Design a protein around this nucleic acid. Structure first.
Lengths: 84, 43, 115, 59, 131, 89, 159
RNA sequence: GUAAGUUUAGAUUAUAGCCAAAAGAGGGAGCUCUUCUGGAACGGAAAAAACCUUUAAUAGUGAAUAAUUAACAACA
């Protein structure tokens, strides 16, 4: 119980001091879930209403789905920047 | 100077390997239970 | 304020770790407040002492003339006694000097962790 | 680790459902916790524009 | 004879404006200056927001492991750890295993720190509290 | 490299190595009945988890988990040692 | 009931819970034992991608192989010339990490990077707020810049 | 401690403040006067020209601080 935090969720944290004493060594191997502690995969195999249905599915507001005018539509940047 | 354009750079850091130990997700650090029982399950 | 404040007592000596004999020679003073909105006499004294920039160390002599000047600006400065644990630096060691936050000026800087 | 990009994004940005019992509990203290969970402030990568709020159930 | 180009200088910055402002030099010039000044003021305030964002993310990551942000920072300071807040956010996001090790290290120092504070210094300094 | 049918390919490698086919299990579950369900499926070989993947459906998670295993099989872990361009030799 | 005994109640006990640390002698053995296992791990080279935190200028940069770092100033170093970073406080592996106190020994860690480009920053508009501002009271900056590419990170089992 | 000063010659500019806070005087509330001191954030007191923290201004995805609305029924 040298580790000050529970080691059962993410990884086994082992804290150590090097011989010189000016360094701290941490060993963190991951922990896998026990087979017993998991379930097996399940073996058995209109305009107005449209906005309301869209709002209900995604828990969003109806105002989001209404269109916008030509002015803002043209302003949208056609080339979002993505590197790698 | 290089041929690269001189304009505002959004981020001063570029890496192709952002994560080494894995990207955090909510299920990380969450403990399981025997049989993987879901909450409130009578069984 | 009574004049006893500037007349030290044995209890005060122990609290601040100052020996009643061999009085300290040099003062360390830093400006901790702005002179804006302060009367002209306060402004003039600060400029004379050279504490134009705040948080800037200034070394002053612990002499009656300087002590009177420091007293006028006492509220805007922090006073610490400079200490020479290794004594005055030499010409050769003048380049190795370093002033610690404790108020001690070492004449040799070795760049080694005290730890 | 080593997960595919799109599944990795889905898992991190997923929203969770939480259950709260209010029996003999001060609503304000629950509200403070509920606000934290609802707004998504419980996540390490919380961002104002990420819409990372979580479902909260109070009984 | 360059008055047209002087207007173009104002207009080129005002091409993206909306309304009569984009086509009136009297209004276009005022808008261009106002736009530039707004950016200048935000530059100083922009840095402060970034630190606030980093601190907020750290607290959530620390709270995810059950550690308060102030407690985590103080214990790291006691350990002479000088990692900046921006790097701390990256470690939690990209090194969750390391962050837990950091979380365990801070908690262990906190336990040692509490013991040291209760001890009053009479007890020998702990292994993790040794400098 | 384009790999289709990752589950079949994963099984094919395992039989070649004389390893038992992993038993798929639902490690984690969230929002099952909602329109945005999240399923974690872990491949358990000899009751030991070899790879886990997230998916919107159990099938997707199993497919993603298979892909993760294939990378592990061929030593393509996200944490694998980077290639080195510095060597002058 | 012993003298000075207080029955446990809401206010008799503190909200915080006392903890007991392990005995120092065995604790050092665990500390030494863990180091020996890690020393073997370093010797066996059982690690892949590594991340190292390096402090340069007034900034701390978490670094990995092939990373690109930009410094907002000139460096006086020719492009394509490898340089060694001397300020590293932390280096991490897949299953272990090392922490400096406050810095790692130069022997343990050597980090080298190459200079890519010398450039100046994009123009930055400075205009102070004032009554009757006028249009000519504006300044540009284009602060110098430099580009660095991480090349290699070297470690040895010198614990 | 510090670096200006005295004299001679030429020459203008300026010759109307504002508000706070002190010290007085008429007065007995508050008013009415006179005198001394201080001020013109990019922070804070809510919005606050005049109060508090604040030596200038340069880029930076650094760091330590300052001031910074908040306080924890009565019986002998």
């Amino acid at each position: 119980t040298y580790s000050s935090l529970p080691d059962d969720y993410n990884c086994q944290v082992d804290l150590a001091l090097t011989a010189d004493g000016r360094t701290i060594v941490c060993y963190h191997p991951s922990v896998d879930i026990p087979y017993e502690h998991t379930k097996p995969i399940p073996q058995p195999d209109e305009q107005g209403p449209m906005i309301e249905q869209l709002s209900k599915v995604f828990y969003t507001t109806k105002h989001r789905w209404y269109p916008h005018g030509q002015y803002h539509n043209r302003r949208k940047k056609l080339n979002p920047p993505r590197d790698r | 100077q290089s041929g690269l354009d001189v304009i505002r750079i959004r981020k001063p850091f570029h890496t192709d390997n952002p994560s080494i130990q894995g990207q955090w997700h909510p299920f990380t650090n969450k403990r399981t239970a025997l049989h993987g029982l879901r909450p409130r399950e009578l069984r | 304020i009574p004049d006893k404040v500037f007349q030290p007592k044995p209890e005060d000596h122990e609290k601040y770790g100052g020996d009643p004999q061999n009085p300290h020679k040099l003062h360390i003073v830093t400006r901790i407040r702005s002179t804006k909105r302060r009367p002209y006499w306060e402004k003039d004294t600060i400029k004379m002492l050279g504490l134009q920039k705040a948080h800037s160390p200034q070394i002053h002599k612990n002499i009656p003339s300087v002590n009177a000047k420091l007293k006028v600006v006492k509220h805007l400065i922090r006073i610490q006694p400079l200490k020479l644990p290794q004594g005055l630096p030499t010409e050769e060691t003048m380049s190795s000097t370093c002033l610690k936050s404790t108020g001690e000026l070492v004449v040799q800087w070795h760049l080694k962790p005290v730890e | 680790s080593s997960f595919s990009r799109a599944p990795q994004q889905w898992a991190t940005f997923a929203r969770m459902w939480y259950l709260l019992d209010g029996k003999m509990q001060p609503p304000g203290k629950l509200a403070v916790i509920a606000s934290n969970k609802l707004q998504g402030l419980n996540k390490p990568v919380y961002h104002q524009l990420s819409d990372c709020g979580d479902h909260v159930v109070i009984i | 004879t360059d008055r047209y180009w002087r207007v173009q200088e104002v207009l080129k910055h005002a091409q993206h404006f909306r309304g009569r402002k984009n086509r009136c030099y009297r209004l276009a010039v005022r808008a261009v200056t106002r736009a530039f000044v707004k950016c200048t003021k935000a530059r100083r305030l922009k840095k402060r927001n970034l630190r606030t964002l980093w601190i907020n993310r750290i607290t959530a990551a620390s709270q995810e492991h059950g550690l308060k942000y102030p407690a985590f920072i103080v214990n790291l300071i006691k350990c002479q750890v000088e990692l900046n807040r921006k790097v701390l956010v990256d470690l939690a996001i990209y090194e969750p295993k390391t962050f837990k090790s950091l979380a365990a290290l801070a908690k262990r120092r906190q336990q040692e720190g509490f013991a040291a504070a209760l001890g009053d210094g009479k007890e020998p300094e702990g292994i993790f509290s040794r400098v | 490299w384009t790999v289709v049918n990752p589950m079949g390919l994963l099984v094919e490698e395992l039989k070649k190595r004389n390893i038992s086919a992993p038993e798929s299990r639902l490690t984690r579950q969230s929002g099952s009945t909602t329109a945005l369900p999240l399923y974690f499926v872990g491949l358990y070989c000899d009751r030991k988890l070899i790879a886990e993947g997230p998916g919107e459906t159990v099938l997707v998670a199993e497919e993603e988990a298979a892909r993760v295993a294939l990378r592990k099989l061929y030593g393509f872990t996200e944490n694998r040692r980077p290639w080195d361009y510095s060597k002058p030799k | 009931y012993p003298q000075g005994y207080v029955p446990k109640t809401s206010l008799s006990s503190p909200p915080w819970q006392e903890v007991v640390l392990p005995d120092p002698v065995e604790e050092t053995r665990h500390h030494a034992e863990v180091v020996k296992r890690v020393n073997e791990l370093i010797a066996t080279g059982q690690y892949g991608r590594l991340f190292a935190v390096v402090h340069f200028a007034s900034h701390q940069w978490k670094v990995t192989a092939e990373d690109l770092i930009l410094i907002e100033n000139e460096l006086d170093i020719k492009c394509g010339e490898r340089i060694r970073l001397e300020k590293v406080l932390l280096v991490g592996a897949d299953n272990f990490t090392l922490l400096g106190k406050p810095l790692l020994r130069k022997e343990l860690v050597r980090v080298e990077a190459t200079v890519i480009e010398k450039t100046e920053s994009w123009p930055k508009i400075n205009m102070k707020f004032r009554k009757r501002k006028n249009f000519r009271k504006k300044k540009i900056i284009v602060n110098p810049q430099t580009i660095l590419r991480i090349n290699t990170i070297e470690i040895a089992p010198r614990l």
